[PDB]
């Protein structure tokens, strides 16, 4: 395309890349959109939140997973099925059997679960240096999801492993010996979700997995759309929910005077979180989109077929909304909010749930500890999707 020649160049598959990087601002600055070897990805916020929920765009998911490449099999199944992929009716469909528990009113009656967990998760906490993901990040998600799946709590650390264990990022791909590993993962994780499903067979509960063994039921889905569903909700409640606790405690340890901040009126937590979701979202992109039509934003035009990837990481530091943009900041009041949940039919399923979890963990963890501080070496995702700290090395004071 003609329309695509003064587009700044990016791309973010390069291990030598930072989002944070100055021709990253440079590119910003210069045009609202960039071009990528993938897509064209939205830099700017405006155009950010209004594309991710536009109808001439559908989702660009099954998209990625042709264009890196994955060769067929359960993996490659997963993801062009699974509900990231859907759109129209299909979507809609599968949608609504798993709304139910993240209606904003359930997530209020999971509320003191979540502060009782978390309490609970301090308690335990060790008292010299240690690994923050696995002794709050990875525990809090993946209890929360046992009580919302309605699997036993004690199961919490198998049914958090099962997820790390199938890293379908390291799947957006073309090689086969990185893949055993992750068909293998999928699998393992599969066996603990149908032997779940088939108990909710018999006797349904009040579960999210008996939610779904009830539409199963009544006919609204097929036993292959059952379990996928449970599969889904899992992996996204999980990973995303671990990395950004982890990528909370890393921001507040680069700026522990906010942290006082909070102990001092813990009312700060609600916005702290957002400034978090800001600054440094688990998902750098947020919507995949590929274009359903022919049309044209800013002269820029997007024929059918062209991807259209929402950077959050970039649309976040955008200094039109935002002010003093590439400064941690939880005071200031924003007057948009971090488009970190992406939008449109897609948007987050989790979104409350997800605030619900890191506003509770911050609000407690600043009330009854010291500043967080690094202690050692951190260790990061590589992969394309979620991006954070796999391990956290850390202490409070
Ligand atoms: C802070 C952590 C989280 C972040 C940053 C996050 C972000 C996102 C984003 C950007 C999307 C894509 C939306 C789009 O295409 O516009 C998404 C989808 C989704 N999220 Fe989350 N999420 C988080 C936690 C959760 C939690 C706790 C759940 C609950 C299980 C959840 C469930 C889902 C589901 C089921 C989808 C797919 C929905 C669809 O395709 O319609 N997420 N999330
Ligand atoms: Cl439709």
């Known amino acids: 395309e ?37 897509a064209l990805l939205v830099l700017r916020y405006a155009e950010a939140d209004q594309l991710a929920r536009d109808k001439r765009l559908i989702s660009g998911f099954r998209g990625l997973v042709d264009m890196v490449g994955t060769p067929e099999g359960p993996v490659r199944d997963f993801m062009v099925d699974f509900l990231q992929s859907l759109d129209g009716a299909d979507h809609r469909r599968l949608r609504g059997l798993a709304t139910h528990p993240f209606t904003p009113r359930r997530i209020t009656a999971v509320q003191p679960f979540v502060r009782s967990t978390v309490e609970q998760l301090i308690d335990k906490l060790p008292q010299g240096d240690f690994d923050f993901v696995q002794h709050f990040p990875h525990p809090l998600p993946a209890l929360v999801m046992c009580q919302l799946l309605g699997f036993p709590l004690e199961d919490y650390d198998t049914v958090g492993r099962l997820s790390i264990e199938t890293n379908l990022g390291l799947a957006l791909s073309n090689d086969q010996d990185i893949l055993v590993k992750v068909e293998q993962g999928l699998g393992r994780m599969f066996d603990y979700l149908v032997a779940a499903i088939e108990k909710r067979k018999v006797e349904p509960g009040d579960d999210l997995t008996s939610d779904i063994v009830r539409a199963f039921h009544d006919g609204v889905l097929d036993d ?11 992996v996204a409640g999980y990973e995303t929910t671990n990395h950004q606790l982890a990528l909370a405690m890393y921001d507040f340890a680069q700026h522990p005077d906010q942290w006082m901040k909070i102990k001092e009126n813990p009312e700060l937590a609600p916005q702290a979180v957002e400034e978090v979701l800001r600054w440094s979202p688990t998902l750098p992109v947020t919507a995949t989109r590929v274009a359903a ?24 530091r955008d200094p039109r909304v935002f002010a003093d943009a590439d ?34 963990a911050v609000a407690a963890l600043a009330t009854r500890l010291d500043p967080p501080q690094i202690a050692g070496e951190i260790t990061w995702r590589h992969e394309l999707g979620v991006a954070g700290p796999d391990a956290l090395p850390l202490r409070f004071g």
Not at 4 to 32: G, H
Not at 225 to 231: D, S
Not at 303 to 315: D, E, Y
């Open 327 to 360: 400064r941690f900041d939880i005071t200031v009041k924003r007057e948009a909010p971090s488009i970190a949940f992406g939008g449109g039919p897609h948007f987050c399923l989790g979104t409350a749930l997800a605030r619900l979890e890191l506003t509770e």
């Open 224 to 234: 292959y759309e059952l379990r996928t569903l449970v599969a889904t909700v899992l």
């Open 293 to 316: 039509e022919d049309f044209e934003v800013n002269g820029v035009r997007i024929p059918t077929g062209t991807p259209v990837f929402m950077c959050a990481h970039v649309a976040h």
């Open 2 to 38: 003609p329309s695509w020649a003064d587009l700044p160049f990016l791309d973010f598959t390069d291990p030598n890349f930072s989002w944070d990087s100055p021709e990253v601002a440079e590119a910003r600055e210069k045009s609202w959109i960039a071009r990528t070897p993938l």
